């Protein structure tokens, strides 16, 4: 039956080639059922593999678990006899490098918006023991052509698994001196972010040169200056941050967390909700109450399809709200950020906050935090703040069904567990017997749809 199913070719349809990037070619594919468009990375196995396939799929699964508004999202890892297909989210805003050429320089307010996002993502990777090792504006992408949309760190984590064959001069600006000597610790990323921040505020690399040689000579010494005329107008806080990031010795260099919490970042990045946000903000809270009222099985099903099958355009309204609720700018919503946001929501309507808000969130946190990470990441937030009618469109339920049905036509009780277990991690077969009108014992597509609509 599967003899002619293609795994990757079964689900996706290649549309065009975007480019050729180090490890492999990068294509724009399109889901055949849902019509959503993604970016896939095709990497020839025989030519690129340093390790075995079991080890590779282990690393890429770890990457599929990274949920941060400023880190690339990988949906799945397919495979055929010749290549690995790494399906990920498509970003259409271009490289930050192009944004630097257009604007040529950034006010401290704008540069703090961009760099705050690079710090939050880099902090997330480091906590998950991931080092970019090649952080530069060419590997940061704006998610859209909207004005102040998020940036996205891409192209990382593949070094241990694959081999790269290759604009090398561009990379020389951002390497740390210890890389010239063979070290690639977490601190090398902080350095790169510091060179980026220097470039945002002046338009000149701190270690400059027309060729690869001269640049590397200035990097080795680690000497830079604020001598350009345009630095006379730039604040002392900014310079103190750049100096801390470009400390020669990694042991004395500050961390990504220290970059994010630096005062300069707090001064120019205090985004907060306004009266205009009230419509979308109230829709999120109402759907979050409906979330906790639903059962554990229903909540896990909504999280599976909110994290595996949605796209950012559908959640553009909720992306802005999530950003405004993220006071510490670490990319996640802790308990305190939910209570304060729910309180401001009251003050903007004109209602007194005085079941209390604090005791509501206390009960709501275990339900939304289905991974137990201590905070609500973006996927869990949209799973609860989104209109369920959106999540359960027909085309999106078709894909869900085919994901679990190995073989054809029928979903076993065992095969069905994959949906709920992937999210909640907590054996109720009641919904199975209720969803099976034909007494078949397995759930075809129409019984599958009826089951999901009850969860709404
Ligand atoms: C090429 S392009 O023509 O410049 C061009 C035009 C217009 C848009 C894009 N967008 C884009 N969106 C997502 C991605 C994801 C990856 C990627 C890397 C490593 C792993 Cl493990 C998984 C993934 Cl999915 C990627 O490599 N690239 C290519 C570099 O940008 C990606 N590009 C690109
Ligand atoms: Ca460059
Ligand atoms: Ca937070
Ligand atoms: Ca969580
Ligand atoms: Cl100095
Ligand atoms: Mg049946």
Automatic annotation (TrEMBL):
Segments forming domain EF-hand: 313-348, 356-391, 392-426, 427-456
GO molecular function: ATP binding; calcium ion binding; protein serine/threonine kinase activity
Entry keywords, A to Z: ATP-binding, Calcium, Kinase, Metal-binding, Nucleotide-binding, Repeat, Serine/threonine-protein kinase, Transferase
Binding site for Mg(2+) 1: 80, 82
CDD domains for the chain: EFh, STKc_CAMK
Positions bound to Ca(2+) 3: 405, 407, 409, 411, 416
Segments forming domain Protein kinase: 12-265
Residues annotated to bind Mg(2+) 2: 139, 155
Cofactor(s) it depends on: Mg(2+)
Keyword Transferase recorded: yes
Positions of ATP binding: 41
Amino-acid positions noted as binding Ca(2+) 1 in the UniProt annotation, renumbered to this chain: 326, 328, 330, 332, 337
Keyword Nucleus (UniProt): no
Record Gene3D superfamilies: EF-hand, Phosphorylase Kinase, domain 1, Transferase(Phosphotransferase) domain 1
Residues holding Ca(2+) 4: 436, 438, 440, 442, 447
Binding site for Ca(2+) 2: 369, 371, 373, 375, 377, 380
InterPro entries to which the protein is assigned, alphabetical: CDPK_Ser/Thr_kinases, EF-hand-dom_pair, EF_Hand_1_Ca_BS, EF_hand_dom, Kinase-like_dom_sf, Prot_kinase_dom, Protein_kinase_ATP_BS, Ser/Thr_kinase_AS
PROSITE patterns: EF_HAND_1, EF_HAND_2, PROTEIN_KINASE_ATP, PROTEIN_KINASE_DOM, PROTEIN_KINASE_ST
Broadest EC class assigned to this enzyme: transferase
Positions of AMP binding: 41, 89, 91, 95
Catalytic activity: L-threonyl-[protein] + ATP = O-phospho-L-threonyl-[protein] + ADP + H(+); L-seryl-[protein] + ATP = O-phospho-L-seryl-[protein] + ADP + H(+)
EC number: 2.7.11.1
SUPFAM superfamilies: EF-hand, Protein kinase-like (PK-like)
Family: Belongs to the protein kinase superfamily. Ser/Thr protein kinase family. CDPK subfamily.
Name of the protein this chain belongs to: non-specific serine/threonine protein kinase
